[PDB]
Design a binder for this molecule. Structure first.
Ligand SMILES: CC(=O)O[C@H]1C[C@@]2(C)[C@@H](C[C@@H](O)[C@H]3[C@@]4(C)CC[C@@H](O)[C@@H](C)[C@@H]4CC[C@@]32C)/C1=C(\CCC=C(C)C)C(=O)O
Ligand SMILES: Nc1nc2c(ncn2[C@@H]2O[C@H](COP(=O)(O)OP(=O)(O)O)[C@@H](O)[C@H]2O)c(=O)[nH]1
Ligand SMILES: [Mg+2]
Ligand SMILES: [Mg+2]
Ligand SMILES: [Mg+2]
Ligand SMILES: [Mg+2]
Ligand SMILES: [Mg+2]
Ligand SMILES: [Mg+2]
Ligand SMILES: [Mg+2]
Ligand SMILES: [Mg+2]
Ligand SMILES: [Mg+2]
Ligand SMILES: [Mg+2]
Ligand SMILES: [Mg+2]
Ligand SMILES: [Mg+2]
Lengths: 80, 669
RNA sequence: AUGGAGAGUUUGAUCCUGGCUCAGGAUGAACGCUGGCGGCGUGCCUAAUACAUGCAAGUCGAGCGAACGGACGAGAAGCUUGCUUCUCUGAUGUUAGCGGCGGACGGGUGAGUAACACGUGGAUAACCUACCUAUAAGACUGGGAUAACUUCGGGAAACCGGAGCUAAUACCGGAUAAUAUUUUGAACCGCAUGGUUCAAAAGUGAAAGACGGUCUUGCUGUCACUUAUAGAUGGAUCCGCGCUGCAUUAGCUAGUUGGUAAGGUAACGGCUUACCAAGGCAACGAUGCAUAGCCGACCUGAGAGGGUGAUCGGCCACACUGGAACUGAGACACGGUCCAGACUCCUACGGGAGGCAGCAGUAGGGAAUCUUCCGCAAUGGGCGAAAGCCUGACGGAGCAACGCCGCGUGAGUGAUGAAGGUCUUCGGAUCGUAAAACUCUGUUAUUAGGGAAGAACAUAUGUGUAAGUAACUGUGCACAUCUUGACGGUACCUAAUCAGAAAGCCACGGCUAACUACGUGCCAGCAGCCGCGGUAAUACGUAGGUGGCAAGCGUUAUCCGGAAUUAUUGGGCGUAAAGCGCGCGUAGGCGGUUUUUUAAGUCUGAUGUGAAAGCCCACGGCUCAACCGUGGAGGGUCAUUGGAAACUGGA
């Protein structure tokens, strides 16, 4: 094993933990927003805005691709 | 760069002794002490003692493994002969002593196992004097014997060492006790006389009644030892760590260096008559002798060699002048008590292992590329026991041959050859133990299960009675007609004279064209046995008459006639079976001569004679080769391992009635 | 026009047919014999067999805390003012750790793969792209942790946990910003689907500081950071055509083929799922089996063709076997992770570790293929602002007649045909101008001196100039100076000495250049074919001589040739091998005359491309040559486009 390889193991573990936390958060927000849009609720627009915020922040963190974020936003905002 | 130890400080030694005398204990203690401010493996181990490099080779004791002793003594400078205190000189001690003497190796004797019950230092020295006829004298005395053994009186310095524990530490250097003072002074006088028997200067100095100096007496002992005229005798117990330091001190003080030793003589490859002296000189040309070859599972094939003259660096090219090829010395290793170190260079008087030598067997010379010297090889004893070997599964015969080749390269004393007559492969070794170990190693290491037995004996036939006989073959009934007819007298020839064909034809009754054909037919028919299938020998065939047909006569017809003539001669002449008889020359002490002659006569042999030779006896006898199977073991049992013999085919003799009938029955069915 | 040779052998003899054999070239060759040197190349083709050992991937202190360290130089006199502590200052430096980038390149191998893998030509209005470049706009305001470190506990080791504390160019909240997303309107345009531009709004997150200059903490240089749009680079997908043997493999297919909807992806898409339908492929060879990386090229051939796919370059695939995802711009990752499997190793028996198809090397297999070498000086790459570090890439050296090319092993005179060998017709012939002897040279070799280029630089130091500045330091560019070589004191040059150290292999019956004497006597042996050998052997072995080659020469293996012996070029079927025993007839192949039309074939012009290296032609540089370099020409059954209509095809 190379020293840089061991270091990369550590840093990869850290990055994975952070990324999966953030991705789970954005997935939860997207699911909540989609449910609110599907069944009209007074919280619909605020939930959609939160979903879009987290989707775009994920795209900027590179958790999803820009085109993935665009598809999510397109479907969400067309439903809403 | 610069050798860490000089030629004057280098010591190449070998621990030799009888079985279970303490060679490996002594070597382990030596390595431990040199390695302190222990597994013993490899051909040689390099350590350091008091600023001296010490290469140690531990040898085997068994007469079956005399090849190791031979090949070690060839490249070693000094030897430590270990003796069991309770028994002194034993048969294998005598054997290794004679090998060291034939190689002119200085020796120091070490009486181990002083703590054992029955230990007797004086009796061990007396055995040295009597059994070996060696000018050995003690340079130490043991205070206490068996459990009482607790001090050693060094006699060169008249100083007593007291050992307070079995750990080998906390030795007290004290003055000789008063009660042992007289005995110590008498032993010193005896030692001085023994050395003076070789040194004239010392002899005059002692006769003058003047006091001998410590330095002068050390010098004298060193000179005598290096001349192989004096053996210093020490004592101790390697198991309980007493006397090992003194033994190493004596190794340093008395055993020679590659300088003190006599030079080495070799032959130019292109000028065999030319002689080349290879002295211990770094600046001289590089010449070394490869004395051991093994395979190490980590680093590959190792070639252990001793360098006599010159230097050589790892990662270079050398000449194998014996195989006349070029070898790449890739890596050079030296084995220490606990580890192997890679070493960049090797100097005269160093034993090392090369990694990368291909096709370099033991006894080969490795010389500089430009040089073409060939050092003196090693002579090893001829096989004393032979066994027909054969794989249990014929599908493994190729593996068996390859294993035999590798094993013959590993061990010079083990031989394998195919016998044409019998079509059997035979393996010759130094004894039953040797062959047993080799069989087991083939079975396991090489995964070739083999079975061994007594080698088949090729028998011969002959005619005991003379007779005139005739053979006549006619084949005119069908198609082409063939006629042959011959009249031949068959006579018992003088033993050993071979087949003799005589042509007493008168009047051309047998055309001269067909007579060679008759001879060829007789030869073929006698090659094929007439009684049990073995060739017929010692016969005079006199073709004295015959008939022929101007047309039907043919070479094949006359061959058929000769075949029928030999068939009727075998019917009419009472053939017997002959067996090879070996001229056996047995050498042993006179006290076993009766046993040896009794065994000879019990083997159906006859004692030809006896004769003194040196300090022993020689018995000459003729014994059947069949009855000579397993004779080495019986001889060693009869003579306490002191007896040796040689055998060579001498003539054929008639097999007794019962044995011949048994042969015949076996061959028939 | 640049280019094409045949011979032996079936018979008493002949012509024909027909196979066999030989003369040529080639090689990653192997073996036998032999062996002087130099230059340039090439060197595990077998076991994608297993691997000891060393090295092949790090770097950044000008991102960050901490630790070690201790100049310059403080204080008391031990009365030692030269040695001394801690109460300091502590600079030049070094590091384990967090963090950034790089570990996806470079290097190895050809196992798998018959497939859009590869080659060629196209398309993407179905796509992605870190570092680099250009332009524009920004870099605002706050916060919580954690490594390291200290402490406690458990371990043979691998190393593990509990508690406490601290940084950042690490992480996160908030603010403003969009050509990105939703909706509305408009303009233009295109290869269905749609593309480009403009105008309104709604949802909306980005960022960071480090080292300096001026010092007015205001301005500001370099580097670094963020968003958007372009360029470049790199990657992805699709399509026409081409690219292999077998029918003693004829049926295959059920997410299979299409549609609808959704999910998913950089992206279109049965890519996946639910529903509906029964489609899809196939004698123009589906399916199955076997084998195989493909190409540029290489060998051969007059060509057409045939064979091959080492070295070098491109593309692909793989990294003990199989699956998987993580991080990341990029991997489903040779020297990363997880799981399973096989195998191996260490252990204190509690438990741990590994993957040379990287460079050397070991064992094994094999007829057979090298050093566990030196250096980053050159080129290239990673990191860094830079010096510099790393780089088994690479540059070199070592070994091997393995190949090609070059030069040696002497030259002139030398009849007096010296000795001696072999033959003899006993005269003589021949080895033979060969030798001897006289004269000459030193390529080579030995000795002693001189000794390159490859080296550009970078950095550092001086100026000059250009953008910006309020002005500097800096940045770009230009001109100068110090320094930088593993090879290596090697190539090469000079001076002296000696013909002195340096020739072997095969063949000599015909093919096929080269003949005699002895020994043998169908024996020993030779042999590619025809054959030779039983007393006169140019064929067996030796000797002399001769022939061909020559540091090589022979043998074996394999490919093309000769072979028109699979015949398109360029053969045949009465009797030599070959007409189905003969009809009826399907697909396919082929098809009478004239007129008009189309332009699929056919012919012709232009454009793009067919990488580099290679082959051929020319020139230049190594003293020559091989070799190296530079231009040209060539190479498509290639694509787009414009023309002609006789022939084949269509109407
Ligand atoms: C000095 C040393 O190391 O000796 C060792 C080494 C030893 C001589 C061994 C006995 C025997 O295998 C030996 C032979 C000749 C056995 C045959 C081959 O394989 C040889 C290549 C091998 C070399 C040496 C070896 C391996 C030893 C013995 C004897 C052991 C005793 C008995 C009864 C079996 C010993 O240890 O004394
Ligand atoms: N009593 C006694 N036994 C000893 C001594 N030294 C060695 N031994 C034992 O004697 C035997 C000899 O064995 P080893 O040392 O292998 O000797 P080798 O046969 O010469 O190789 C072993 O059992 C040793 O332990 C000693 O000093 N005293
Ligand atoms: Mg022993
Ligand atoms: Mg394959
Ligand atoms: Mg041809
Ligand atoms: Mg990797
Ligand atoms: Mg690896
Ligand atoms: Mg390797
Ligand atoms: Mg082998
Ligand atoms: Mg042809
Ligand atoms: Mg016919
Ligand atoms: Mg017919
Ligand atoms: Mg028929
Ligand atoms: Mg080209």
């Amino acid at each position: 094993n190379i020293k840089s390889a061991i270091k990369r193991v550590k840093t990869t573990e850290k990055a994975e933990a952070r990324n999966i936390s953030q991705k789970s958060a954005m997935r939860t927000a997207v699911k909540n927003a989609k449910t609110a849009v599907s069944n009209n609720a007074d919280n619909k627009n605020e939930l959609v805005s939160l979903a879009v915020k987290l989707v775009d922040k994920a795209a900027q963190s590179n958790l999803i691709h820009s085109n993935k974020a665009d598809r999510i936003k397109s479907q969400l905002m067309t439903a809403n | 760069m610069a050798r860490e130890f000089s030629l004057e400080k280098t010591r190449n030694i070998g621990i030799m002794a009888h079985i279970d005398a303490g060679k490996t204990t002594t070597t382990e203690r030596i390595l431990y002490y040199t390695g302190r401010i222990i597994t013993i493996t490899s051909a040689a181990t390099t350590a350091a003692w008091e600023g001296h490099r010490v290469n140690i080779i531990d040898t085997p004791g068994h007469v079956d493994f005399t090849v190791e002793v031979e090949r070690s003594l060839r490249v070693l400078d000094g030897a430590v002969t270990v003796l069991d205190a309770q028994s002194g000189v034993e048969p294998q001690t005598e054997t290794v002593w004679r090998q060291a003497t034939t190689y002119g190796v200085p020796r120091i004797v070490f009486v181990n196992k002083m703590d054992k019950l029955g230990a007797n230092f004086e009796y061990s020295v007396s055995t040295l004097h009597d059994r070996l006829q060696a000018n050995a004298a003690p340079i130490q005395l043991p205070i206490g014997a068996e459990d009482e053994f607790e001090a050693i009186i060094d006699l060169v310095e008249m100083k007593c060492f007291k050992y307070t524990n079995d750990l080998g530490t906390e030795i007290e250097e004290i003055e000789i006790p008063e009660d042992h003072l007289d005995r110590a002074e008498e032993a010193r006088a005896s030692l001085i006389e023994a050395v003076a028997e070789t040194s004239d200067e010392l002899m005059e100095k002692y006769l003058g009644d003047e006091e001998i100096s410590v330095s002068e007496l050390k010098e004298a002992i060193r000179q005598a030892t290096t001349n192989v005229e004096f053996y210093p005798v020490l004592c101790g117990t390697a198991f309980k760590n007493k006397g090992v330091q003194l033994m190493l001190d004596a190794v340093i003080d008395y055993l020679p260096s590659p300088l003190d030793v006599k030079p080495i003589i070799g032959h130019r490859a292109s000028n065999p008559e030319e002689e080349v002296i290879a002295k211990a000189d770094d600046s001289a040309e590089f010449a070394a002798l490869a004395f051991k070859v093994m395979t190490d599972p980590y680093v590959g094939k190792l070639t252990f060699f001793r360098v006599y003259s010159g230097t050589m660096t790892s990662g270079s090219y050398v000449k194998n002048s014996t195989k006349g090829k070029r070898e790449r010395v890739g890596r050079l290793l030296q084995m220490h008590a606990n580890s192997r170190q890679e070493i960049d260079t090797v100097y005269s008087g160093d034993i090392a292992a090369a990694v990368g030598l291909k096709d370099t067997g033991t006894g080969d010379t490795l010389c500089g590329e430009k040089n073409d010297i060939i050092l003196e090889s090693m002579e090893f004893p001829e096989p004393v026991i032979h066994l027909s070997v054969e794989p249990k599964s014929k599908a493994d015969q190729d593996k068996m041959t390859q294993a035999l080749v590798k094993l013959q390269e590993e061990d010079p004393t083990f031989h394998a050859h195919t016998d044409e007559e019998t079509g059997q492969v035979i393996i010759g070794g130094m004894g039953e133990l040797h062959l047993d170990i080799l069989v087991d190693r083939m079975k396991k290491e090489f995964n070739v299960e083999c079975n061994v037995g007594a080698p088949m004996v090729s028998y011969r036939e002959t005619f005991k009675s003379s007779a005139q006989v005739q053979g006549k073959f006619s084949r005119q009934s069908g198609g082409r007609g063939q006629y042959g007819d011959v009249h031949i007298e068959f006579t018992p020839n003088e033993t050993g004279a071979g087949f003799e064909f005589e042509n007493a034809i008168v009047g051309g009754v047998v055309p001269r064209e067909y007579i060679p054909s008759v001879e060829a037919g007789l030869k073929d028919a006698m090659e094929n046995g007439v009684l049990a299938g073995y060739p017929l020998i010692d016969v005079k065939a006199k073709l004295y008459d015959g008939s022929y047909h101007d047309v039907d006569s043919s070479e094949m017809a006359f061959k058929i006639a000769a075949s029928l003539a030999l068939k009727e001669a075998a019917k009419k002449c009472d053939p017997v079976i002959l067996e090879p008889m070996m001229k056996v020359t047995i050498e042993m002490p006179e006290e076993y001569m009766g046993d040896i002659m009794g065994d000879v006569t019990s083997r159906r042999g006859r004692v030809d004679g006896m004769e003194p030779r040196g300090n022993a006896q020689v018995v000459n006898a003729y014994v059947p080769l069949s009855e000579m199977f397993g004779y080495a073991t019986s001889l060693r049992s009869n003579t306490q391992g002191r007896g040796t013999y040689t055998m060579y085919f001498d003539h054929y003799a008639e097999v007794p009635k019962s044995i011949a009938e048994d042969i015949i029955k076996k061959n028939k069915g």
